[PDB]
Write a protein that binds this ligand. Sequence first.
Ligand code: A1BGZ
Lengths: 39, 156
Amino acid sequence: DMYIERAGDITWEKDAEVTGNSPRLDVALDESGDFSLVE
Amino acid sequence: GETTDGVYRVMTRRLLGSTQVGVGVMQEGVFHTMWHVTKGAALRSGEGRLDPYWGDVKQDLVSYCGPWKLDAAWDGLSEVQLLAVPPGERAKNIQTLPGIFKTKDGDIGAVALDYPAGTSGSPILDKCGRVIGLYGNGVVIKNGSYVSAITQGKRE
Ligand SMILES: COCc1cc(-c2ccccc2C(=O)Nc2cnn(C)c2)ccn1
């Protein structure tokens, strides 16, 4: 049996840690909901 | 059960100890998560039961107690925040400029942040604190890193 536990409010937070890149990727989405790279 | 708006962990005891299998959003009395987290099973909140209401394996989404409520969209321009809720770790904002998944049916925002799989369902927010989608359905890239769609449902 799966159960839920509150972890926080949903808020924007000024001066969070800023990270990650912004890749443009060709992708396909199959009937099982899996993404795959189209190269 | 607890039905205050916010972000929630999804836990199981069917494995060793208490294991976090994913995360979701409580908004307007509806619980929102990714299909691959719950596989559409019922959930417990304290002594209360949450039953599945809507779901779609291809969208990889599921709602509990009522229809999908989250309808905000990535602007296509601005940085966003993953409110990451990792297993055993405090909820933490991470600000990022989404990339793009280009598909035959249209472009989707994507976020290139690597977290454990049990982070699946953590919300992605815009500057007004609205949920523009859920992290944890995406692809493994040349590098070996993880890039997640911004996955959003439709509000009927
Ligand atoms: C097993 O640990 C390594 C790992 C983890 C991930 C991962 C990372 C962040 C958020 C979600 C996921 C994730 O698992 N997504 C998923 C799972 N099942 N389906 C149908 C979609 C992907 C790949 N490998």
